[PDB]
RNA sequence: CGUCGUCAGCUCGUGCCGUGAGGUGUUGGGUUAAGUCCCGCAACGAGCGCAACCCCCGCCGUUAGUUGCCAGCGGUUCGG
RNA sequence: UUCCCGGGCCUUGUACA
């Protein structure tokens, strides 16, 4: 009945945060939908290597963002008090939904 | 990338269509990216340095 | 049948003049021999194990017996002075007395203590080496 | 030749980003620009301190600057005057109530940027280039550091012609991903031009 | 190819008739990666052949191919700054390749409007022992055996 | 009852369910003759069946996704082969030689910078 | 940054040869995509390169089921 | 793999600020 959306550039920290949230929630009574891996989004930048010419060099860079889902069911009062108070790693962003 | 041009680029130019973008790092006006506000050369430098979070060399 | 070292596979260039360098190979041999006696080899994937074992067996082939030399020897015993001319030259260079079982085609000058006999005929080599070794044995 | 950056080559593994925070399409460039300003200001300010690395982090409208310095004493000052003045300076540079943190690097000989900076100092003080590179490499190699290699650009000793000097000792396997190679660059401004100093330090494996 | 022998690709046997020669011929027809079009053209031609000729189209096609297989070819060779057309025997592989290519070219050179019609006509004529394909085969053979003087350049 | 095979070929994915029946095959709720209509090659998708004198015993439910018609046919073929193997392991001994248990690993090669398409270089002349 | 060139080569420590520049190692034979490996050898080893370590595609597995899927199964009326 | 172009190896005659 309450939805957690997790975003991050890294997958290690994102997985760690997802596990922490799901564990804290499950331990606090109500059932958990669990970490659903949503498809990641990739932006590609192709830039000529040389500063002047030689347009046949074209280094490739990518920026990828990962997405998770948790979707806690039957929100416990103690659950809803423990959430919005947890501390996140430096990368992970949390969105709250009903 | 004269100083005058860099400064002129940052004012409301009496019109919308007179507005353009420059590399926020070196003032290059040619090959900038909306996402970063950096030119291609500065993009490459900062991406190699590791100062652009989440950005890595691609291989598929 | 003595504490004496020996070389019977091949004489590497500089077993005496370049003693320090070869001693490093000896140390590598001992460390590898220790490693294969350890259960810690289970890392380093099997083909890496293969190359390590090849290195070890090469080292054992060329350096078995030479392992006993902790330093420069006090004398050298050459079966054929002509054949092992490199060893003779090295020993001459390093003021190491040379004992050799020479024959007709050898140079008497380069040998400090010469035994004019045969270099072929197993029997002759057997007799001479046996007598020498027995004398060393009873001398100790 | 044209070797690529040995940090960019290993951003995925064995090396980590200097900036660690997430931002959407809307707010990426602004955060990046203020990060650029912060790095510029600290580089200008803390040169004497022996700065090696700056880390920027964001959680929720909060900035956690972490500066790795050879001598933290220089950074703090006495009674924490300097650290406080720097904190307020950064806060009024970027209105996000920053939190400056100071780390001390063990054995600055194992820091590639610090080594490069020191060699650049030596160059700017008109020392013998070859001797400087040799001493730097020897010093690095003496402090563990399984491999080391220092390159100086050109225009050696006010010469008319530019020429790479360069000296190495040990193992510097640039081609391997699991190398944990530390890279540093320094720019030496001489009365007769500019010189580049690159330092590679190979610190263990995996 | 300096090292290997460049092993020939094994083509998937036909589905209608279940033989590889038909597949090769279809491929030889197919242009711009349109294989369905080539298959339809070939089968239309086969239907035409069957409708206008006593026996099955497969036998007609096979024996036409066998009828348009040359044995002597001339190859350009450099000797003493001079260019000589040395006669050589052609392997079954090259035989079949040349046969199919020539059949297709001759079919495409006919004045008939529809591709199926042209294919059918060429196959029937080559079956009889005439047409562009057989004529080119004969010209190729006669270009050899007319310059057997150079055959000693074994090549 | 239901014997299932997956099959994959070049961005096309199949799901085949084989059940006892008269030997009628449906694809995405349509019929084989009407889905792959106008395609000569279609019947290929059924060779793994008629290789073992099927088409009298197994009705097939086919769900196919992605890729193209030909890729879909190959996916169907691999799926049917896998399902037949699952039906009876001994079948494997006779399906495998004819080359049906193999998934074609060949896919579209990625484009390279400085090339027109992945292999073709730009033309140059007048050296 | 381009290029020779993704071509396999460029050197070093100790030893040995030559008055010396220098040579050997790194010349020989087999085999490699490769100075890749093997055998011999007045050399024994090492460094930068090659290869591997990283990533994508191809088969299978555990973990998780929403906004993705529908083999079962109960109304639907076409529609997961 | 004879010839066209390029690279490497073995053997061979001229020139290297
Ligand atoms: Zn710029």
């Amino acid at each position: 009945k309450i939805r957690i959306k997790l975003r991050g550039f890294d997958h290690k920290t994102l997985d760690a945060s997802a596990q922490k949230i799901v564990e804290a929630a499950r331990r606090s009574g109500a059932q958990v939908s669990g970490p659903i891996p949503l498809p990641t989004r990739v932006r590609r930048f192709t830039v000529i290597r040389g500063p002047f010419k030689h347009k046949d060099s074209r280094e490739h860079f990518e920026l990828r963002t990962h997405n998770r889902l948790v979707d806690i069911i039957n929100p416990n009062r103690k659950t809803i008090e423990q959430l919005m108070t947890l501390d996140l790693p430096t990368g992970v962003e949390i969105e709250i939904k009903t | 990338a004269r100083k005058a041009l860099i400064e002129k680029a940052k004012r409301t130019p009496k019109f919308k269509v007179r507005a353009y973008t420059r590399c926020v790092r070196c003032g290059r006006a040619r090959s900038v990216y909306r996402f970063f506000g950096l030119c291609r050369i500065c993009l490459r430098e900062l991406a190699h340095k590791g100062q652009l979070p989440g950005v890595r060399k691609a291989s598929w | 049948r003595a504490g004496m070292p020996y070389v019977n596979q091949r004489w590497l260039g500089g077993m005496l003049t370049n003693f320090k360098t070869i001693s490093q190979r000896v140390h590598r041999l001992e460390e590898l021999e220790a490693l294969f006696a350890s259960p810690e080899i289970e890392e380093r994937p099997k083909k890496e194990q293969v190359r390590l074992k090849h290195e070890l067996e090469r080292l054992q082939k060329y350096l078995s017996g030479f392992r006993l030399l902790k330093r420069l020897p006090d004398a050298i015993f050459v079966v054929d002075p002509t054949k092992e001319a490199i060893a003779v030259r090295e020993a001459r260079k390093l003021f190491i007395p040379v004992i050799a079982l020479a024959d007709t085609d050898s140079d008497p000058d380069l040998v400090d203590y010469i035994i004019p006999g045969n270099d072929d005929a197993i029997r002759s080599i057997q007799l001479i080496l046996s007598r020498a070794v027995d004398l060393i044995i009873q001398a100790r | 030749g044209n070797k690529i950056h040995p940090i960019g080559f290993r951003l995925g593994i064995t090396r980590d980003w200097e900036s660690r925070w997430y931002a959407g399409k809307k707010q990426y460039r602004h955060l990046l620009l203020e990060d650029q300003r912060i790095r510029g200001l600290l580089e200008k300010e803390l040169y004497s301190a022996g700065l090696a690395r700056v880390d920027i982090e964001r959680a929720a409208d909060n900035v956690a600057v972490t500066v790795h310095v050879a001598k933290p004493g220089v950074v703090i000052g006495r009674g924490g005057e300097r650290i406080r003045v720097l904190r307020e300076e950064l806060a009024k540079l970027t209105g996000k109530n920053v939190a400056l943190n100071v780390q001390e690097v063990q054995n600055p000989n194992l820091s590639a940027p610090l080594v490069a900076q020191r060699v650049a100092e030596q160059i700017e003080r008109r020392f013998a280039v070859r001797r400087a590179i040799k001493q730097a490499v020897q010093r690095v190699m003496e402090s563990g550091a399984k491999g080391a290699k220092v390159i100086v650009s050109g225009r050696i000793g006010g010469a008319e012609q530019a020429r790479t000097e360069w000296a190495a000792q040990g193992r510097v396997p640039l081609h391997t991903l699991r190398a944990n190679i530390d890279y540093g660059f320094a720019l030496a401004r001489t009365t007769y031009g500019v010189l580049g100093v690159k330092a590679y330090i190979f610190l263990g494996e995996v | 190819a300096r090292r290997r022998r460049a092993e020939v690709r094994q083509l998937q046997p036909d589905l209608v008739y279940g033989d590889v020669l038909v597949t090769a011929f279809i491929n030889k027809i197919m242009r711009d990666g349109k294989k369905n079009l080539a298959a339809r053209i070939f089968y239309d031609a086969c239907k035409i052949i069957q409708e206008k000729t006593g026996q099955e189209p497969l036998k007609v096609f096979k024996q036409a191919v066998e009828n348009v297989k040359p044995r002597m070819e001339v190859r350009s060779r450099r000797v003493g700054g001079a260019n000589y057309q040395v006669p050589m025997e052609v392997s079954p592989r090259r035989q079949q390749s040349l046969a199919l290519r020539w059949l297709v070219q001759a079919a495409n050179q006919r004045p008939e409007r529809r591709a199926a019609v042209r294919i059918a006509h060429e196959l029937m004529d080559a079956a009889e022992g005439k047409g562009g394909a057989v004529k080119k085969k004969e010209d190729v053979e006669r270009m050899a055996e007319a310059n057997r003087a150079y055959a000693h350049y074994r090549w | 009852e239901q014997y299932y095979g997956t099959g994959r070929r070049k961005e096309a994915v199949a799901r085949v369910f084989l059940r006892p029946g008269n030997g009628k095959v449906t694809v995405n709720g349509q019929d084989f003759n009407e889905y792959f209509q106008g395609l000569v090659r279609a019947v290929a998708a059924l060779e793994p069946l008629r290789a073992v004198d099927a088409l009298g015993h197994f009705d097939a439910y086919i769900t196919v996704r992605g890729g193209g018609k030909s890729g879909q046919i190959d996916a169907i073929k691999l799926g049917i082969a896998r399902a037949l193997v699952q039906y009876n392991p001994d079948y494997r001994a006779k399906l495998k030689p004819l080359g049906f248990l193999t998934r074609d690993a060949r896919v579209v090669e990625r484009k390279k910078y400085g090339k027109h398409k992945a292999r073709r270089a730009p033309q140059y002349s007048k050296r």
Side-chain angles (χ1 to χ4, degrees):
Chain A
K1 277 212 270 179
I2 191 151
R3 183 155 282 167
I4 308 297
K5 184 78 73 63
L6 295 97
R7 263 87 61 81
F9 291 145
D10 192 300
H11 62 76
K12 287 100 161 184
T13 71
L14 202 61
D15 292 330
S17 312
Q19 294 319 341
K20 176 161 84 148
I21 294 163
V22 73
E23 202 47 31
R26 184 190 298 109
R27 191 218 32 66
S28 172
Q31 311 90 69
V32 297
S33 183
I36 301 144
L38 294 189
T40 79
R41 275 209 171 187
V42 170
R43 317 179 65 96
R44 315 265 193 183
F45 313 104
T46 308
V47 286
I48 319 158
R49 281 169 180 249
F52 174 55
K53 55 157 164 165
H54 328 96
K55 207 215 184 174
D56 297 345
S57 283
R58 317 305 280 259
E59 188 142 28
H60 289 271
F61 298 101
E62 67 176 28
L63 163 72
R64 50 172 67 254
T65 184
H66 323 272
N67 303 66
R68 303 287 155 165
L69 209 55
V70 172
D71 186 75
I72 302 301
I73 69 169
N74 302 113
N76 187 1
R77 300 299 81 86
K78 198 270 288 178
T79 301
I80 67 164
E81 77 185 1
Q82 69 181 356
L83 270 302
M84 286 72 74
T85 62
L86 186 73
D87 282 328
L88 303 171
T90 187
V92 176
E93 182 163 325
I94 303 302
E95 183 174 76
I96 191 68
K97 196 52 213 71
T98 303
Chain B
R2 278 144 39 199
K3 270 301 307 308
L5 287 180
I6 293 165
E7 298 303 329
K8 176 159 81 181
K10 311 156 90 153
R11 302 191 302 257
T12 70
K14 197 212 275 179
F15 295 111
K16 275 308 306 307
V17 285
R18 297 215 165 185
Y20 65 105
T21 52
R22 293 193 163 246
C23 172
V24 305
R25 191 173 170 260
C26 78
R28 190 175 213 261
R30 265 285 173 194
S31 189
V32 309
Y33 281 63
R34 279 181 182 180
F35 190 91
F36 296 114
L38 291 167
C39 79
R40 69 174 218 266
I41 302 151
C42 295
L43 185 145
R44 209 180 81 98
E45 282 174 10
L46 290 200
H48 281 315
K49 268 162 176 203
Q51 286 166 23
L52 302 183
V55 172
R56 55 191 299 120
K57 276 173 62 56
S59 64
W60 70 95
Chain C
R1 203 180 57 210
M4 302 321 199
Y6 70 98
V7 175
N8 71 321
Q9 213 49 40
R10 192 180 89 92
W11 180 274
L12 319 176
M15 301 216 93
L16 259 59
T17 58
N18 206 17
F19 186 80
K20 309 299 171 282
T21 300
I22 313 297
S23 291
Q24 272 156 348
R25 283 289 96 171
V26 159
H27 305 165
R28 178 65 180 173
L29 168 63
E30 79 185 38
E31 80 176 84
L32 281 175
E33 199 147 318
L35 163 68
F36 282 174
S38 176
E40 280 189 322
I41 205 47
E42 310 326 319
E43 213 180 324
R44 322 157 157 271
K46 191 182 85 179
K47 64 187 298 310
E48 187 161 359
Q49 310 202 107
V50 159
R51 63 150 275 181
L52 289 200
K53 182 168 300 311
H54 292 170
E55 181 172 5
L56 175 72
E57 69 201 29
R58 171 173 192 85
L59 276 188
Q60 303 215 46
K61 162 171 184 181
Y62 282 161
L63 272 80
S64 189
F66 195 80
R67 208 184 311 182
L68 309 176
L69 276 172
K70 290 312 145 74
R71 64 185 170 85
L72 267 176
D74 275 340
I76 198 152
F77 209 103
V78 181
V79 162
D80 190 15
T82 313
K83 172 75 168 69
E84 291 90 8
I86 307 102
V88 158
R89 199 172 324 114
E90 285 193 27
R92 292 317 307 237
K93 186 163 210 286
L94 293 169
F95 309 116
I96 288 157
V98 179
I99 315 150
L101 182 56
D103 59 317
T104 63
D105 79 326
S106 307
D107 195 336
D109 315 322
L110 305 184
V111 185
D112 292 300
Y113 314 82
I114 181 173
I115 314 165
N118 203 309
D119 49 345
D120 315 331
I122 299 158
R123 297 216 59 247
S124 58
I125 310 154
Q126 181 63 254
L127 197 146
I128 299 316
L129 266 188
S130 161
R131 293 320 178 86
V133 158
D134 296 4
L135 178 57
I136 286 169
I137 286 313
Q138 68 178 234
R140 284 176 184 267
Chain D
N2 317 321
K3 275 78 62 179
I4 74 153
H5 210 286
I7 305 174
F9 188 47
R10 301 169 180 82
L11 283 176
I13 53 153
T14 70
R15 299 293 299 180
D16 189 1
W17 287 265
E18 284 194 47
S19 299
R20 286 154 306 218
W21 43 265
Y22 175 92
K25 191 204 164 286
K26 207 67 180 75
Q27 211 200 359
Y28 196 103
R29 77 172 168 277
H30 305 294
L31 266 61
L32 160 66
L33 170 61
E34 78 175 353
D35 275 12
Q36 284 316 110
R37 277 169 184 178
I38 291 158
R39 283 206 170 82
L41 191 146
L42 290 178
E43 273 293 335
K44 196 175 183 179
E45 278 290 315
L46 271 74
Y47 177 78
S48 65
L51 199 150
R53 172 199 196 81
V54 186
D55 282 27
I56 310 295
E57 293 191 314
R58 290 139 195 281
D61 187 73
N62 286 308
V63 191
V65 185
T66 295
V67 187
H68 308 251
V69 168
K71 307 179 284 281
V74 177
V75 176
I76 308 299
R78 265 167 283 107
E81 284 280 281
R82 179 146 171 82
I83 179 158
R84 207 181 287 152
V85 76
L86 287 173
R87 277 201 72 263
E88 67 79 21
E89 175 50 61
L90 288 171
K92 75 173 172 289
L93 165 64
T94 64
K96 275 195 184 286
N97 62 279
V98 311
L100 182 53
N101 277 42
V102 172
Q103 185 62 0
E104 177 189 300
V105 291
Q106 315 297 33
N107 195 349
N109 288 314
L110 295 201
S111 171
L114 280 191
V115 163
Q117 283 180 57
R118 162 156 186 88
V119 179
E121 174 177 4
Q122 295 296 321
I123 300 305
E124 286 179 346
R125 266 156 56 168
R126 295 97 169 277
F127 278 73
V129 177
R130 290 188 197 184
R131 205 210 304 152
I133 302 165
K134 286 316 287 175
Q135 286 176 2
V137 164
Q138 183 62 256
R139 190 175 337 113
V140 169
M141 270 298 321
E142 274 168 353
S143 296
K146 276 211 280 170
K149 169 183 196 181
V150 177
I151 304 159
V152 166
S153 77
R155 201 93 196 273
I156 300 308
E160 207 55 40
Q161 289 180 329
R163 45 184 193 87
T164 303
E165 209 65 73
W166 151 70
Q169 192 176 312
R171 289 180 35 73
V172 195
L174 291 182
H175 274 70
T176 184
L177 273 301
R178 52 155 192 190
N180 195 344
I181 282 170
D182 202 349
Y183 168 81
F185 175 78
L187 179 60
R189 295 183 66 210
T190 81
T191 63
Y192 57 90
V194 288
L195 275 81
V197 182
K198 286 163 173 179
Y200 314 117
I201 301 178
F202 172 67
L203 296 166
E205 200 147 331
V206 191
Chain E
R2 275 210 198 265
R3 307 194 212 213
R4 300 284 87 83
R5 192 76 90 83
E7 51 275 65
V8 183
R9 283 166 199 276
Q10 286 296 41
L11 299 174
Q12 212 60 22
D14 190 4
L15 271 57
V16 158
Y17 290 150
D19 61 9
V20 299
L21 185 60
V22 167
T23 301
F25 193 68
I26 290 180
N27 288 15
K28 192 48 70 180
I29 298 171
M30 158 197 67
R31 72 174 76 179
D32 310 342
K34 300 182 179 181
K35 192 177 211 80
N36 194 10
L37 179 52
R40 266 195 294 127
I41 284 175
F42 178 79
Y43 295 151
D44 295 331
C46 276
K47 178 270 181 180
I48 288 160
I49 290 156
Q50 166 70 102
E51 188 280 331
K52 279 181 85 179
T53 304
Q55 67 270 59
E56 53 271 42
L58 182 50
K59 292 306 181 289
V60 174
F61 159 71
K62 272 190 170 181
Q63 78 89 18
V65 161
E66 277 292 321
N67 192 89
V68 190
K69 280 187 199 187
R71 278 143 166 74
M72 296 297 107
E73 189 153 56
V74 290
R75 305 195 88 145
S76 181
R77 169 79 155 84
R78 174 48 60 108
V79 165
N83 297 324
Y84 299 158
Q85 275 75 348
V86 176
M88 317 295 287
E89 312 185 312
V90 288
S91 61
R93 171 92 168 95
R94 187 142 164 82
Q95 280 207 340
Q96 191 189 244
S97 313
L98 287 169
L100 298 178
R101 182 187 309 125
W102 296 346
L103 268 182
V104 161
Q105 270 167 232
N108 281 351
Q109 264 183 286
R110 277 192 167 279
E112 314 314 322
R113 286 166 177 171
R114 303 317 296 181
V117 160
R118 294 197 306 271
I119 295 289
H121 277 189
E122 197 58 39
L123 278 156
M124 287 200 281
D125 293 330
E128 304 180 355
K130 71 184 66 53
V134 173
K135 184 223 187 296
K136 191 184 190 296
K137 177 264 202 195
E138 266 179 320
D139 303 358
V140 157
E141 282 191 353
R142 93 175 63 262
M143 204 172 154
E145 201 77 21
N147 55 7
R148 267 179 76 180
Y150 311 128
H152 64 255
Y153 305 151
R154 182 68 283 161
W155 177 227
Chain F
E1 175 210 305
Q2 278 184 173
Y3 307 152
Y4 157 79
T6 312
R8 273 184 201 80
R9 168 82 198 277
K10 199 163 86 172
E11 312 291 340
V13 52
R15 304 172 322 117
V16 307
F17 302 112
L18 288 183
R19 303 175 191 95
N22 44 287
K24 178 189 85 180
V25 50
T26 184
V27 173
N28 278 337
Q30 279 181 260
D31 200 42
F32 200 92
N33 192 20
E34 62 152 351
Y35 183 66
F36 301 111
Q37 70 89 2
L39 269 79
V40 178
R41 204 181 67 85
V43 291
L46 309 187
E47 318 315 338
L49 282 187
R50 76 177 90 175
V52 300
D53 192 22
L55 279 90
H57 328 271
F58 314 96
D59 291 331
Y61 197 77
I62 307 299
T63 76
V64 76
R65 184 179 295 275
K69 286 290 179 74
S70 296
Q72 289 187 357
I73 291 162
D74 277 23
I76 284 171
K77 198 162 84 213
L78 177 59
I80 283 173
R82 282 179 167 185
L84 284 192
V85 163
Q86 172 192 77
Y87 171 109
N88 176 22
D90 181 290
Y91 273 84
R92 169 189 276 277
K94 71 184 282 189
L95 269 189
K96 188 198 147 292
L98 192 47
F100 279 104
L101 267 302
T102 292
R103 186 263 195 270
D104 298 327
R106 48 175 185 169
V107 305
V108 168
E109 182 189 62
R110 66 144 287 185
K111 192 194 169 296
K112 320 285 174 55
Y113 63 87
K115 317 301 211 55
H116 281 269
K117 50 180 202 73
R119 272 272 175 86
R120 183 192 166 89
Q123 189 179 263
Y124 73 90
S125 195
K126 211 58 175 182
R127 280 293 184 83

